[PDB]
Amino acid sequence: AMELEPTLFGIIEALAPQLLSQSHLQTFVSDVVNLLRSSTKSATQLGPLIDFYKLQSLDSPETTIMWHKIEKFLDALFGIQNTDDMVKYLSVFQSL
Numbered sequence: 001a002m003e004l005e006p007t008l009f010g011i012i013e014a015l016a017p018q019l020l021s022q023s024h025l026q027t028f029v030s031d032v033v034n035l036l037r038s039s040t041k042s043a044t045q046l047g048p049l050i051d052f053y054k055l056q057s058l059d060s061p062e063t064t065i066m067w068h069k070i071e072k073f074l075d076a077l078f079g080i081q082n083t084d085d086m087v088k089y090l091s092v093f094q095s096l
Contacts, residue, residue, distance in 0.1 A: 004036075005029050007090050014096040015073060016066035019057065028053060036078060046078055047071065 008029045012020075020028060028049075035045050050071050057063055073093060080086045 002087050002090065004090075005033055007094065008032060011073065011090065011093045011096065012070060014093075015069045016063075019063060019066050020053070024053075032074060041078065046074055050074070 009025060012025060012029065019025075031049055032046070035041070035049065050067065054067055057067070077086070077089060080089055
């Protein structure tokens with residue numbers, strides 16, 4: 001029953017309330033899933049993606065931590081190589 005893009009949308013908003021606008025969080029989720037479903041992952045395109053959004057963001061201790069939780073959440077996600085394990089991982093973060 002879990003579908004990937006709205007699940008990620010919900011988790012990111014729970015990690016980082018109000019950090020991104022609705023429109024930008026959706027664009028971010030779409031770019032994340034595009035990288036996640038790419039055939040072969042090269043280097044670490046994920047961190048550069050996140051760094052790009054972080055340039056547009058606020059310096060404050062709250063938002064710094066929000067971005068750290070996002071990048072650790074996504075780093076582990078991009079380590080998961082099969083779908084049932086991914087569902088399990090996401091279902092854990094759905095408690096937040």
